Design a protein around this ligand. Structure first.
Ligand SMILES: O=C(O)CCC(=O)C(=O)O
Ligand SMILES: [Fe+2]
Ligand SMILES: [Zn+2]
Length: 347
């Protein structure tokens, strides 16, 4: 009954191994994994067919510039933290790996991941690392026509197509150079879109994910822990400064799953899927957001941050008009009360 329960309501993070055949059509494969219930978990992993490479070699990049490197200062205790960013000033990749590999900032010795995870939550407030994040650019070679983050050809393109508007990292690619203990705070994508992340090379990147079905519960918990922030902004978590350990989530009955991403692997986050994580050591990742028809409803109801007057806000008008014409008049009159079903796929 009700195909919904494909990912047997465990909303567990799933992993897929597509054939070069299925791997060719991006939009098609996303709809395919959703039919398998992958979206339930909010996060999913996709291993590319062995004979697939986005770039020949990553030897020719030490000269690449990281214009706005960031030092991450974390403050907090017993599972709850706030991350403050500090703009250092441009440096080259070559300069970055130096620091990343120095014993001052290199990965510690460990056996099992569970061990590396414990060390992360124990020392994240010590030795503020540097993260070469939000660097505009791609590392894909022009000919690569499979899963090219620079041109996925999803309907998110309608934004550019329609208004010429470009949003860095959103409808354009971003590169992330990290090192041990650099992390990304709990958050959903801008406008609750999907995101794709490819780990070009280096040490792993571990992820935590909360089923979108339970996203609202995570928010209530976060609100209770950071009441001051919750009042200064509707969606304070969008500030991407809040870190919450797996133990705190377990303690408060907030369902979640964890997964470690390795070089050459893709990660996909789904609409309203809250996620967070950290890098094991020196590595490089590329990402951008994308949309699907199933995303439209989420886009229409995404709660945006109010305080900051430079936050990402996309006009939904073109999507409702083109894919939901029968409801355009009603929506536009601010009286479309559609409820979202997080289990339902993109027919
Ligand atoms: O790599 C990071 O620090 C964040 C990546 C991310 O947020 C994403 O891929 O959606
Ligand atoms: Fe994200
Ligand atoms: Zn805000």
């Amino acid at each position: 009954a009700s195909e919904s329960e494909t990912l047997n309501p465990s909303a567990r993070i799933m992993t897929f191994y597509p054939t070069m055949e299925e791997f060719r059509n991006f939009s098609r494969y996303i709809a395919y994994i959703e039919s398998q219930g992958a979206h339930r978990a909010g996060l999913a992993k996709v291993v590319p067919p062995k004979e697939w490479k986005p770039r020949a070699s990553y030897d020719d990049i030490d000269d690449l510039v990281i214009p706005a490197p960031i030092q991450q200062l974390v403050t907090g205790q017993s599972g709850l933290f706030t991350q403050y960013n500090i703009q250092k000033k441009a440096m080259t990749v070559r300069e970055f790996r130096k620091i990343a590999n120095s014993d001052k900032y290199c990965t510690p010795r460990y056996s099992e991941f569970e061990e590396l995870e414990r060390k992360y939550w124990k020392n994240l407030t010590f030795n503020p690392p540097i993260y070469g994040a939000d660097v505009n650019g791609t590392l894909y070679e022009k000919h690569v026509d499979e899963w090219n983050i620079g041109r996925l050809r999803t309907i998110l393109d309608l934004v550019e197509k329609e208004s010429g508007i470009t949003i860095e990292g959103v409808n354009t690619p971003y590169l992330y150079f990290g090192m041990w203990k650099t992390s990304f705070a709990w958050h959903t994508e801008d406008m609750d879109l999907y995101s794709i992340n490819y780990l070009h090379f280096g040490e792993p990147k571990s992820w935590y994910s909360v089923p979108p079905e339970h996203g609202k519960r995570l928010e209530r918990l976060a609100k209770g822990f950071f009441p001051g922030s919750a009042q200064s902004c509707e969606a304070f978590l969008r500030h991407k400064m809040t870190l919450i350990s797996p133990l705190m989530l377990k303690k408060y009955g907030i369902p979640f799953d964890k997964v470690t991403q390795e070089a050459g692997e893709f990660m996909i986050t789904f609409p309203y899927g809250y996620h967070a994580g950290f890098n094991h050591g020196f590595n490089c990742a590329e990402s951008t957001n994308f949309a699907t028809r199933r995303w439209i409803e989420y886009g229409k109801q995404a709660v945006l941050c109010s305080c900051r007057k430079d936050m990402v806000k996309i006009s939904m008008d073109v999507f409702v008009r083109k894919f939901q014409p029968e409801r355009y008049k009603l929506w536009k009159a601010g009286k479309d009360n559609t409820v979202i079903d997080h289990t339902l796929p993109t027919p």
